[PDB]
Amino acid sequence: MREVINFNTKWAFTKEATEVPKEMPEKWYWVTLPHSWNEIDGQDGGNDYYRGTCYYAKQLKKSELPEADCYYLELRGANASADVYVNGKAVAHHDGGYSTWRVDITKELTEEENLIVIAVENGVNDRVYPQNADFTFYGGLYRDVNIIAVNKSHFDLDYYGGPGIKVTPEIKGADASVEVEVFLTNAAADQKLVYTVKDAEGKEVAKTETAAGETKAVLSIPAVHLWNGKKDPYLYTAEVALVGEEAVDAVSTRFGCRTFEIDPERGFILNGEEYPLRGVSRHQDRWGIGNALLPEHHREDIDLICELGATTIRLAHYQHDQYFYDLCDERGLVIWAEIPYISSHMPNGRENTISQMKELVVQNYNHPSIVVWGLSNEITMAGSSDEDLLENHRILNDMVHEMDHTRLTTIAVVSMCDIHDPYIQIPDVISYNHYFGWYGGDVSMNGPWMDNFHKEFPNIPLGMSEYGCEALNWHTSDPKQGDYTEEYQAYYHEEMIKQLFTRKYIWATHVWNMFDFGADARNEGGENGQNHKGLVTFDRKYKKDSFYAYKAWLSDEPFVHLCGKRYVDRVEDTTKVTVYSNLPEVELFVNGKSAGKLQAEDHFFHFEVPNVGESTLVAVAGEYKDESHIRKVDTFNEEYSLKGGFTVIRMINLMGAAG
Amino acid sequence: MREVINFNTKWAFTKEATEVPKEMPEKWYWVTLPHSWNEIDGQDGGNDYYRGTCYYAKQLKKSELPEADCYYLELRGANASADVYVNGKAVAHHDGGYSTWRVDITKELTEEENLIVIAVENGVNDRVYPQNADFTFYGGLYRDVNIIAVNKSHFDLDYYGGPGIKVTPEIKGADASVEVEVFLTNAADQKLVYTVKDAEGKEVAKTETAETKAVLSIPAVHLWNGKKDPYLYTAEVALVSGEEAVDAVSTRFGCRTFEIDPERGFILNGEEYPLRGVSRHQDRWGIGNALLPEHHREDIDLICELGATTIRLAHYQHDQYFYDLCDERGLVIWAEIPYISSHMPNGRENTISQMKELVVQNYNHPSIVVWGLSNEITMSSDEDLLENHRILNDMVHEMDHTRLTTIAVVSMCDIHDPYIQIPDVISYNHYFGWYGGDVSMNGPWMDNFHKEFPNIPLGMSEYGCEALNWHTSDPKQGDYTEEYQAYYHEEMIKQLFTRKYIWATHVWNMFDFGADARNEGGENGQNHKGLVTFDRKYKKDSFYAYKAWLSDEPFVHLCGKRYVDRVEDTTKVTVYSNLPEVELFVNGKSAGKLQAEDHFFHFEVPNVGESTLVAVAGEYKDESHIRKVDTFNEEYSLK
Ligand SMILES: O=C(O)[C@H]1O[C@@H](N2CCN(C3=Nc4ccccc4Sc4ccccc43)CC2)[C@H](O)[C@@H](O)[C@@H]1O
Numbered sequence A: 001m002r003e004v005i006n007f008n009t010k011w012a013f014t015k016e017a018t019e020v021p022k023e024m025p026e027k028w029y030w031v032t033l034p035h036s037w038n039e040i041d042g043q044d045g046g047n048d049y050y051r052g053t054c055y056y057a058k059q060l061k062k063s064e065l066p067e068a069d070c071y072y073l074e075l076r077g078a079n080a081s082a083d084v085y086v087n088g089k090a091v092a093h094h095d096g097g098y099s100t101w102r103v104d105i106t107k108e109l110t111e112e113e114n115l116i117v118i119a120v121e122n123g124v125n126d127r128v129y130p131q132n133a134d135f136t137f138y139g140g141l142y143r144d145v146n147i148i149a150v151n152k153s154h155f156d157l158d159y160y161g162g163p164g165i166k167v168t169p170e171i172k173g174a175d176a177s178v179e180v181e182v183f184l185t186n187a188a189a190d191q192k193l194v195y196t197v198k199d200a201e202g203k204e205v206a207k208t209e210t211a212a213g214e215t216k217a218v219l220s221i222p223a224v225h226l227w228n229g230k231k232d233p234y235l236y237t238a239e240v241a242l243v244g245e246e247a248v249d250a251v252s253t254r255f256g257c258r259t260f261e262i263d264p265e266r267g268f269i270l271n272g273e274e275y276p277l278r279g280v281s282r283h284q285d286r287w288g289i290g291n292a293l294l295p296e297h298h299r300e301d302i303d304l305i306c307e308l309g310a311t312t313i314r315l316a317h318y319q320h321d322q323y324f325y326d327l328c329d330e331r332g333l334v335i336w337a338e339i340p341y342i343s344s345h346m347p348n349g350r351e352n353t354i355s356q357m358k359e360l361v362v363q364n365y366n367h368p369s370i371v372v373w374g375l376s377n378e379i380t381m382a383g384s385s386d387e388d389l390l391e392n393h394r395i396l397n398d399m400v401h402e403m404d405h406t407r408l409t410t411i412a413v414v415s416m417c418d419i420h421d422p423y424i425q426i427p428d429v430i431s432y433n434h435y436f437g438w439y440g441g442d443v444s445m446n447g448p449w450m451d452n453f454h455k456e457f458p459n460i461p462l463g464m465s466e467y468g469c470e471a472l473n474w475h476t477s478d479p480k481q482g483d484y485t486e487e488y489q490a491y492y493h494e495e496m497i498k499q500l501f502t503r504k505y506i507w508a509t510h511v512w513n514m515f516d517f518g519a520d521a522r523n524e525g526g527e528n529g530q531n532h533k534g535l536v537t538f539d540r541k542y543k544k545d546s547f548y549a550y551k552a553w554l555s556d557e558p559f560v561h562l563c564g565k566r567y568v569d570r571v572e573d574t575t576k577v578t579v580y581s582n583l584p585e586v587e588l589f590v591n592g593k594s595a596g597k598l599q600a601e602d603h604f605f606h607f608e609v610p611n612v613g614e615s616t617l618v619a620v621a622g623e624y625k626d627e628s629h630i631r632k633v634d635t636f637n638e639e640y641s642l643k644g645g646f647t648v649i650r651m652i653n654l655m656g657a658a659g
Numbered sequence B: 001m002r003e004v005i006n007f008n009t010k011w012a013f014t015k016e017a018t019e020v021p022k023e024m025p026e027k028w029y030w031v032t033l034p035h036s037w038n039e040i041d042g043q044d045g046g047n048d049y050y051r052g053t054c055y056y057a058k059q060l061k062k063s064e065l066p067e068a069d070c071y072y073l074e075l076r077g078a079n080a081s082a083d084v085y086v087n088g089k090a091v092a093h094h095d096g097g098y099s100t101w102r103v104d105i106t107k108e109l110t111e112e113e114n115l116i117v118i119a120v121e122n123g124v125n126d127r128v129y130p131q132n133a134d135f136t137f138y139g140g141l142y143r144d145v146n147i148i149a150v151n152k153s154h155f156d157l158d159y160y161g162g163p164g165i166k167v168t169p170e171i172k173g174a175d176a177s178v179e180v181e182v183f184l185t186n187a188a189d190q191k192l193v194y195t196v197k198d199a200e201g202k203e204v205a206k207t208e209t210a211e212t213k214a215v216l217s218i219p220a221v222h223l224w225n226g227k228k229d230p231y232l233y234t235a236e237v238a239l240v241s242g243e244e245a246v247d248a249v250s251t252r253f254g255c256r257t258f259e260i261d262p263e264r265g266f267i268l269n270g271e272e273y274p275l276r277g278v279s280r281h282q283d284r285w286g287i288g289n290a291l292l293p294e295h296h297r298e299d300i301d302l303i304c305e306l307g308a309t310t311i312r313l314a315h316y317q318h319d320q321y322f323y324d325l326c327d328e329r330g331l332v333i334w335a336e337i338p339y340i341s342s343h344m345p346n347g348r349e350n351t352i353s354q355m356k357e358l359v360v361q362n363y364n365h366p367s368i369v370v371w372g373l374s375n376e377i378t379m380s381s382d383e384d385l386l387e388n389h390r391i392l393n394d395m396v397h398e399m400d401h402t403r404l405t406t407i408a409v410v411s412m413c414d415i416h417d418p419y420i421q422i423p424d425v426i427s428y429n430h431y432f433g434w435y436g437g438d439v440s441m442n443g444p445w446m447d448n449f450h451k452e453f454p455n456i457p458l459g460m461s462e463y464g465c466e467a468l469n470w471h472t473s474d475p476k477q478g479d480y481t482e483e484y485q486a487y488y489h490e491e492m493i494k495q496l497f498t499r500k501y502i503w504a505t506h507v508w509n510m511f512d513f514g515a516d517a518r519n520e521g522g523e524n525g526q527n528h529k530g531l532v533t534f535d536r537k538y539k540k541d542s543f544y545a546y547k548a549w550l551s552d553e554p555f556v557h558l559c560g561k562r563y564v565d566r567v568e569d570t571t572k573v574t575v576y577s578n579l580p581e582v583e584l585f586v587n588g589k590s591a592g593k594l595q596a597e598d599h600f601f602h603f604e605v606p607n608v609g610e611s612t613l614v615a616v617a618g619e620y621k622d623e624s625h626i627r628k629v630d631t632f633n634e635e636y637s638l639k
C-alpha cells in the first residue's frame, strides 16, 4: 500500500530573494521540474553562470494527498546544497547535488495549505565537492521531487536516500544463492516479511517468509540466467512486502547475477570469459536544458552509445540519474561510478566525501552494471599526496570495501602524476587521464607510456580513464594539433584505438567525451562555454567522423562512412579521402568512375582521388554504401579555419578554464 | 546592404521590478526569445495567470555590430503593450501585441555598453484589445527581436511595421500588370531598379525610375490557384546610387482573382473553389505562444494532411512565417483583429491602429482574401459600435481594393441587426450541438438566413464540440467524449459541406488551445474543442472525419481505438475513408462490406471476448482492439 506522488509542477523560483518568504510568492517565476537556473548562462562561456542562493516555493495542499500515516518529501537532485523549509520551519539540510535524499514531514503538515520552501545554492566553499572542475555546476532542482505516502511501519527511507533493499547473489556453479536484506523503520514483531524473486518474464522462481526481525533471507535460483553484459543483460526482480495479514508496504528492485574480475594481464573478466571493456564516458547535461534532463534524454544518450558499440561507460564525475543506471542494467553496459572528489583536495571536504560516497553505494548497490566505485579524479593536480590526502583516500577505500564485497575501487590519475605516487597504491585498480596529442606531446606517446607503468607495477591493473581531442566545424587538409579541426580529431582517435584496443592488459578505455558538454569557463574554439572533446555535438544532433572510427571497431551494424562530408571546398589537385567500415573491403567511386578498391584490417581506409570540379564520391562495401561531395577551388575557404608547447593564445584560453 | 541581426539570446527577465534598471541586472532570470511568462500559469486554469508589467534587459555592444548609418530595433510580437528604453531613455511605445513595430535607436547608441530595457504589459484597461475573449493573453516578447542595419537612405521602416513594398497585381485576361509601390526615407538623384522574378528566379520584368510607383507586366501569367498551384513570384527593388546599392526590399506575391458569390460560394480564378477548413490559435502546450519556426511548420503540416483549403487565423494577426507558409501551400486565409466580445468605446483608437497594422504588413500575402473586423462583438448594437465598425470598413476598403471585409457574428445576434449589413460578407459562430439544441439545427438555420438576405454571402466562421479522453457507447451532448465530438462533426459536414452557398466553413478549433479561465472537461485552463490535442501529439477521431472529405491521400481510419472495454453484446464500429468500399474483419472473419458516399462507414459487430478489428480498403488497412466486459469501465466517463 505504498504510493509515490509527483511534485514537479507549479514551482515559484527566483534568484533575487534574500530570505525565506513567509507567504507564498505571487510575482515569482513559474517553473516545472526538472529545472536549473544555469541552463543559459552556464553554457555561453565566461565562467559567469550565476552561483548563489535561489528559492523554490510550492504549496502541498493536505487535501490533494492520499491518506497515509507518514509523508516523505523525496528529492533526487539538488545541486549543490539545499535546505527544506515547511511553513517557514527549517526541516532538513543536504550537501552534494547528485544523490537522493528524503525527509519526513508528517508532523509539519499542520495547516491545510502548507508552504514548502527549498533554498538551493551552488556557491564556493571548502566543504562540498565539486569546487574545482571542468564542468558547469548547474544549480537548482534538476531532478524529480516526490512525496512518498507509506504506513507507519515502512521500509527505511531515512538512510542516505537508499532503496531499503539490498540484494547480493552468490553464483555457486550453475545456481545462485541470493541474499536479500531489507531495512525497516518502526516495525512490529508481529507483521511478517515475504521475500519474492521473480523471473525476467514475471515468473516466480523462489520465495521465502521471515519475521520483522529477520531482515536477511537467502533465496535460491536454479539454472540462473547470468547477467552477461551486452551478450545477455538478464535481470531478475526482488520484492519484499511487510505483511497483519495484508501488505502494508513493499520495496522492490531488479538485479543481475554475474561474476567479474580485473586481471592485470587479461583485462576485464566477465562471468569467466574475457570481456574487453572499451567504451566512453558521458556528462549528464544537454545543450539548452542544463542538466534538467528528461527520461527521453537519458534514453537518447544511451541509444547513441549502443549504436557506437561501447561495452562500458564512465559515469563521471558524480552520481548519475537512477533511470540511466537502470538503462545500463537493461542494455548490459559495464559502468564506472564515482564521486565529485575531483582536482584539489580540500581538507574540510572529508565529511562530504564519506557522505556522497556513502550515498553513491547505498543508492546504486543493486545495479549489476556497476563494477567499480571511483574514489577521485586527478586529485593530485593541486600538489602531492600529503598525509591528509592519503588518509582521506584510505577512509573511503576501506569504507567502500566494508559495505560492498562484490565490486572493486578505482581512481582516475592526472597525467602529470608520477606513477610512484603513494595514493596510486590505495585502490584496487587505477586508470590514467592522458591527453598526449591534444595537450603537449604526440599521440604515439600513449602506447609506450601505458607500457612503462605496466612494467613497474605489473600486478596493479592499469586502464585509460580519459583521453580525447577537441573538434568543431573546422576543417583542413593539413591536420595539426591546435587547429580544432574535425579531421585531426579523427586521426587522434584512429591511432588511439590502434594502441589501446590492441593492449589487452589495459582493463578499460573511456573516451572523453561521448558528447560535448557545458563548461562555462572554456573559451576554446569558436563556441565558448563548451568542451568540444566529444564524438557527438552538445545538442546530440551531429555525429563527428570520430564517432564512426569507434563504430567500425565495436559495432556489428555493417556500415560505410565517408569522412569529412563537411569539407567540400578543397584546393589540392589530389585530395585525401578516408572511409570507415567494419567490412573487409571498400571501393571508392569519384563521379561514377572507380578510383580503386582498398583493404584495411584496421578499418581505416585512406584513399586518394583527383580534385576536379564538383565530384560526387561514393564508397561501396558489399550492399552498403555512402556518398560525399568535393569541389576544387583556387584558394582555401576561410570558413574552415579558426582564424606543453601550445601557442600563447591557446594556453590563455586553457588557463581561463580555471578562474 | 540591409542587414538583419538576431537579438533574442541572453535576456534578463523579472516580474518584480517597478522601474527601469540603471545598470544591467545581475540577479534577474535569464531567458531567450521567443519567450512568455505565462507558459505555465496561463494554461493551468483558474484565470490566475499573472497580468502586469515585466521587464526585459539586454546589452547592445556597439563594436559587435555591422555598422552602416542607421540601426532600427524591430519587435515582431510584444503582448500586449510595451515600452522601449535605451540607456534609461524612452524611445518608443506600442499597443497591441500581435503586429510588428520598429524604432530607430541610432542616435541613442552613444555609449559602447548600450542597455536596452523593454517593459511589456498585459494588464486590464479600457483602451487596448483584446480584453474579453476565450483565449489566454500570453504576455512578454513571444516573437523575434531584431536589429536592422540600413543606409541613411533606406526603404520606409517607420510606417506601421510595413515592408516598404506593395505589390498589387492586375490580371488583364492572360497577362498581368503588377503594380509595385515602394516607400523611402531620407532619400535622394537616386534611381530605383525594379525586378520581378518567377519561381525559378528568372527575371520576368525590369525597369528603372528615379517615382516610387512602377507597373511591371509579366505575360503568360502563372496564377496563384490555391492548393492546385500556389505559384509565387518574388519582387525586388533596390535603391541605386551610381553603380552600387544601399538598400533593397523584396517580397513574394501571387497573381489571382476571386469572388464570394452569395449563390455559388467561393470562386477562385473564375471557377468555384469551395473554402472548407478550420481555424488555429498561435499557442502550444508548455511554451505559451513563444513559437519556433518548427512549431509553425508542424501546425501547417497537420492541417495540410487534413486537406483543408482555408484557415481562419483568429483572433488576431499571426506570425509572418505562418502567413508565408500559407502562401506556399496555397491556402486561403481569413485574418482579423482582436476586436472581440465587448465593444470598448475607448478602444476604437486601438482598432484603427491594429487594423492599419494588419493590412499594411500582410498586404502582399496572396493567401489572404478577407479582412475581419470583429468577432461576436454583440455579446445589441449601438451607434458607437456601429460607427466604429463603419470606420474600419471604410479604412480597409480605401487601403486595399483587392480584398473583402467580413465579421464573425455571435449565434444569438438577431439577423436583422444593423451591424450585419456593414461588411461585404458575414459569418456566424454557431454551436448547435454543444451549447444546447441539436446538431441538426445548423442546416435549417443557415437556410433561413440565406432566405432573408440572399444577396449577402453567408458563411460559418466557427463551430465545434469539446472532446477529451472520455468514451461511451451512448454519445450525448455533455459527456465530453471523443465519440460525440465525432457524431457532431459527422452531421455538421453532411449539413455544411453539401450547401454550396456557404462561402466558407471554419472548424473550431484545429488544435486545443490555452484558455486559463476555462475549468471543464477534467483538464482545466484549456478549451478541448480542437481536432488535435494541445500538444499536437494526438489527432482526434474527428480529425479523420474531415480528412475523408478533403484529402486525396488514400487512408482508412478505425474510430474508437481508445474505447476498448465495452459492455454490449453487439458493438458499433465506425470507419472513415476517402475510398469507395471498406470491409471489416472481426478476428479474421469478415463482417461484411460497406459503401458510403458520406465517407462515414458504420458497421455492426459482435462483442465476444478479446476481438481484433481490421478495416480494409484495398491495400490500406487499419487495426483496432476491443473486448467484452460486464460493467462500463468508469475510467472512460467524466464522472
Ligand atoms: O581537459 C579536459 O577536457 C578533461 O579532461 C581532464 N582534464 C582536467 C584538467 N586538466 C587540464 N589540463 C591541462 C593540460 C595541459 C596544460 C595545462 C592544463 S590545466 C587545465 C585547466 C583548465 C581545464 C583543464 C585543464 C587535465 C585534464 C579532466 O579530468 C576532465 O574533467 C576534463 O573535462
Ligand SMILES: Cc1cc2nc3c(=O)[nH]c(=O)nc-3n(C[C@H](O)[C@H](O)[C@H](O)COP(=O)(O)O)c2cc1C
Binding pocket: A156, A157, A158, A159, A162, A163, A164, A165, A166, A183, A184, A361, A362, A365, A403, A404
Ligand atoms: C547497500 C546497503 C544499503 C543499506 N540501506 C540501509 C537502509 O536503507 N536503512 C538502514 O537503516 N540501514 C541500511 N544499511 C545499513 C548500514 O550500512 C549500517 O548498517 C548502518 O545503518 C550505518 O551506520 P552509520 O552510517 O551511521 O555509520 C544499508 C547497508 C548497505 C550495505
Ligand SMILES: Cc1cc2nc3c(=O)[nH]c(=O)nc-3n(C[C@H](O)[C@H](O)[C@H](O)COP(=O)(O)O)c2cc1C
Binding pocket: B156, B157, B159, B162, B163, B164, B165, B166, B183, B359, B360, B361, B363, B399, B400
Ligand atoms: C499595404 C500598404 C502599405 C503601405 N506602406 C507604406 C509605407 O511603408 N510607408 C509609407 O510612407 N506609406 C505606406 N503606405 C501608404 C499609406 O497607407 C498612405 O498612402 C498614407 O501615407 C497614410 O498616411 P497616414 O499614416 O497619415 O494615414 C502603405 C499603404 C498600403 C495600402
Ligand SMILES: O=C(O)[C@H]1O[C@@H](O)[C@H](O)[C@@H](O)[C@@H]1O
Binding pocket: B133, B134, B135, B375, B376, B429, B462, B508, B527, B529
Ligand atoms: O466558445 C468557444 O468555445 C469558442 O467560440 C467563440 O465564441 C470564441 O471566439 C472562442 O474564443 C471560443 O474558444
